[PDB]
Design an enzyme around this catalytic site. Structure first.
Site, PDB file in Angstrom:
ATOM      1  N   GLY B 138      48.051  28.635  29.908  1.00  0.00           N
ATOM      2  CA  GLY B 138      48.184  27.745  28.767  1.00  0.00           C
ATOM      3  C   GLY B 138      48.046  26.341  29.288  1.00  0.00           C
ATOM      4  O   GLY B 138      47.190  25.592  28.826  1.00  0.00           O
ATOM      5  N   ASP B 155      53.344  23.831  22.691  1.00  0.00           N
ATOM      6  CA  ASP B 155      54.730  24.271  22.664  1.00  0.00           C
ATOM      7  C   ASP B 155      55.663  23.357  23.478  1.00  0.00           C
ATOM      8  O   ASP B 155      56.564  22.728  22.933  1.00  0.00           O
ATOM      9  CB  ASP B 155      54.785  25.692  23.227  1.00  0.00           C
ATOM     10  CG  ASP B 155      55.945  26.497  22.682  1.00  0.00           C
ATOM     11  OD1 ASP B 155      56.037  26.644  21.438  1.00  0.00           O
ATOM     12  OD2 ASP B 155      56.751  27.003  23.501  1.00  0.00           O
ATOM     13  N   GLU B 158      56.203  19.678  28.872  1.00  0.00           N
ATOM     14  CA  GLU B 158      56.346  19.594  30.334  1.00  0.00           C
ATOM     15  C   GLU B 158      55.746  20.802  31.036  1.00  0.00           C
ATOM     16  O   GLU B 158      56.337  21.898  31.038  1.00  0.00           O
ATOM     17  CB  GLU B 158      57.818  19.480  30.759  1.00  0.00           C
ATOM     18  CG  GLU B 158      58.355  18.058  30.890  1.00  0.00           C
ATOM     19  CD  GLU B 158      59.249  17.650  29.716  1.00  0.00           C
ATOM     20  OE1 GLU B 158      60.347  18.236  29.586  1.00  0.00           O
ATOM     21  OE2 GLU B 158      58.860  16.743  28.933  1.00  0.00           O
ATOM     22  N   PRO B 162      50.828  25.484  37.949  1.00  0.00           N
ATOM     23  CA  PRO B 162      49.816  24.523  38.410  1.00  0.00           C
ATOM     24  C   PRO B 162      49.672  23.189  37.616  1.00  0.00           C
ATOM     25  O   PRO B 162      48.922  23.088  36.614  1.00  0.00           O
ATOM     26  CB  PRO B 162      48.541  25.357  38.416  1.00  0.00           C
ATOM     27  CG  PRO B 162      49.060  26.738  38.758  1.00  0.00           C
ATOM     28  CD  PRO B 162      50.269  26.846  37.866  1.00  0.00           C
TER      29      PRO B 162
END
Lengths: 274, 274, 274, 274
Positions: B138, B155, B158, B162
């Site tokens: 994502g 969503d 933060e 990766p």
């Protein structure tokens, strides 16, 4: 320390506040008073196990109940608060210079006493010269008033004790009677998630007597569902027709001239109720 | 039966739901999944002890995250949902004919699996031809996209794993890169009562890269404080400039063309955060 | 009113008491003191979130800690109570005419202060001429005593602060030193359901220094599992060899000459621990 | 995960167990069945919101209800268990070779069904040839028995449904009728802390018909107060007169030949009740 005060806002849902200590616990002639110090919201007052206000979020209810009708009125001068023991609505009414006298009527003098003592930031203006505090019925008081008030903010929409309000659907016609010819009245009318029926009924009953009946919204984190509702019955002034020049600088933490209009924009499922 | 699920939304405050039975309990590679049947809200999904959605109130989050940016965009065609395992935002995205393809990327395939099974009214559209469901990172997906999407609903703000998003304040610039030249992105940004810092920070960091950065509101009774916040980063279109003719009939229970604009009118204390 | 105080006696299990109001809440140099009025048990004292005593059931612990060792001793005259701030064990010790002087040593004077104030039925005898109350360490006190006491009732079995008790397995040898040649000591040693290890360890360590090491039982409804355990280390007298003529009428609500012996009959799984 | 099951053992006090998931939830013709997996006690069965047994502590109740009357009887051969759906008392009865047949009568077949499925360590012996399981009234069954049983272990002491037990204080005389001339019966009779009246009443009523009426004790951590009570009505054999040679090796985790006698040594305040 795991001391928690829980309010089952529904038989199946509720909020739970961590308590540091109780400040005052007393069974009154009228209700069970409990001032408590919570870690999250500061001092909080509970009446019959239900949250009334807390230092942290009290400003929402107090500002939205007071400022929407006062600014809707071109010049409010005589205002009545029924059931505002904590004195928070009075504190907000006094921010309007046009108000000559604000009368507060509450049956329980002990609510006023302990709010002055533990909720000073909310009840600290009750000693103001412009305020007339009366420990008396409130519904009896409205029943005995005849075009005396510009704005009347009411606590409960269902009269208990002398229901002399025998006007058709008594209460609202009783309030119209107490209001001046261009009067305005506001009544909290719960949330749309658990007691939506109340919003439909009140909205319909108030409309039966006031040409203008709107419903506005506000976020109160300590009240059921986080979304509280307010019914405004007006005899002449539309709250959505307020002139921009009508507003003046006022110190608030929630209310805004824009919020004033935006609070009337209801989520689709809420409009469906009226 | 006194089986209750409590979410301490703060160390000192929370909500408590009465549970009838658990539907599925499983520790995933990523999180602790718990589908439960509550008496008040129907089936409710919890991830790591925190409420994700419930049958009763899921519509608010899903509609407001999807419809505000889609209608702000003159013609959304390629949309990305990062972290929408329950498929609720996808369900709303599909109500827009202009959408050619809606991609859903979520790391936990088990959230998708059990939502399809226990939250059919929310996940039932993931099998649609216009949807492309991918069980993958994502954030890695956004890192590897270059002007492919018109609207991206995110969503978490933060990135974990990766963090190749090494652009200045990486994430938002990473999103601008994945968006088309006139793209729009939305990210929930918590509540203003307990985590107000997040609103200030995100609002400032997003503004560093998008010419248009606004914050809108919505009432989600199952989320902390009852008032949830959303950050919208737009490269060109203003959500408050939407043409009236732009809207079309769409079935919703919260969102409204008026709510669309009213959601951006912030309570005084909330504006103060930005 | 849903104000409840919960004690997680285990991360997964606990008891919950309905509270009417708090009497005193204070963070001491040593611990978190909380006197509270419960509806079920009367005033209850909590130290660091754990139940210490309550007006309703305090008698069990106080009587069983005091009377078993005092009657086991042919003639107790000099007695020490370490950590008995509430004064309950002292109240029971005074029912024995043979006792010339009962010393009470507790580090927290505030426990003594508030117990006198809110637990008068428990702390009311601390003002007696036969009692010598000292607000001091307790472990330091035992470390500095040499054959001065007939019976020593101890609160915690693990010394904190000056661990000058460097005798092999220090504490018990420290206690033997403070005891007279035919002394007896008693220490509560938790429950056998959640902390059975403690019973095994203490029983073994005490046996290393006292020829007589027994374990007795009692029902304390406000303590973890409802079954509490007591370790008795005796240098010469067997608690099960008490002469019938040794007993005399004494007012109690739990303890009995028969309970005296029956408390040492352990359920199979409890014997297995020693 | 904060899913907890609370049992308000009193309006003002209770225990709270952390739940991992529910195993079976069903509303029966007779009661609300809830098998749940707790972290502390393993699988636990609740009937009408009250704890019935759990894998961790079931042995106390099962052993003390069974073994005290069986060993008191010189040679028990025909035994009846009324209301022992979980099969735990039956499991214990079968440890006695003298028992030719053990009849189990319970109105709710679903309790038997789900106990076999989720409490195998408790219900696993109901499939034994020496056991005769009948899903039927129990009180009706006792009403229709005439000197058939040596020992009868009863669940509730108050008959519901056909109260054909019109003997003076019906129930006990009904039991005497079902018992052989030297029969014995046992009935749990709650705790002495919250429902002490029940112990007084049953003890008096049972004495009206059995020459021998004693009360014994046991620690059940999951039951109100941690101290449970049992009433034994015997027509001829005294439970405190058991011959030492009468006992034989039997596998138990609580019961002991010594516990057999010690359980009858009541704390002073408990004797006061009878």
């Amino acid at each position: 320390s795991e001391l928690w005060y829980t309010e089952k806002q529904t038989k199946n849902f509720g909020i739970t506040m961590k308590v540091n200590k109780t400040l005052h616990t007393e069974q009154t002639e009228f209700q069970h008073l409990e001032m408590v110090e919570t870690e999250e919201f500061g001092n909080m007052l509970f009446l019959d196990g239900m949250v009334m206000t807390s230092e942290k979020d009290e400003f929402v209810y107090h500002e939205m109940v007071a400022h929407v009708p006062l600014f809707t009125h071109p010049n409010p001068e005589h205002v009545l608060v029924v059931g505002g023991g904590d004195g928070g609505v009075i504190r907000e009414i006094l921010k309007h210079p046009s108000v000559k006298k604000a009368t507060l009527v509450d049956i329980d003098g002990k609510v006023i006493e302990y709010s002055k003592k533990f909720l000073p930031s909310i009840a600290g203006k009750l000693d103001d010269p412009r305020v007339d505090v009366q420990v008396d019925d409130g519904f009896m008081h409205i029943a005995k008033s005849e075009n005396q008030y510009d704005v009347i903010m009411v606590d409960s929409t269902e009269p208990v004790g002398p229901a002399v309000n025998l006007f058709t659907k008594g209460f609202y016609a009783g309030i119209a009677k107490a209001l001046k010819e261009d009067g305005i009245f506001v009544a909290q009318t719960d949330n749309p998630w658990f007691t939506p029926e109340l919003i439909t009924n009140v909205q319909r009953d108030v409309k039966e007597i006031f040409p203008i009946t709107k419903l506005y919204t506000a976020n109160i984190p300590t009240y059921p569902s986080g979304l509280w509702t307010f019914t405004i019955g007006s005899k002449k002034y539309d709250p959505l027709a307020v002139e921009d020049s009508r507003f003046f600088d006022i110190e608030t933490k929630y209310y805004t001239k824009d919020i004033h209009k935006a609070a009337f924009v209801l989520p689709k499922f809420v409009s469906d109720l009226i």
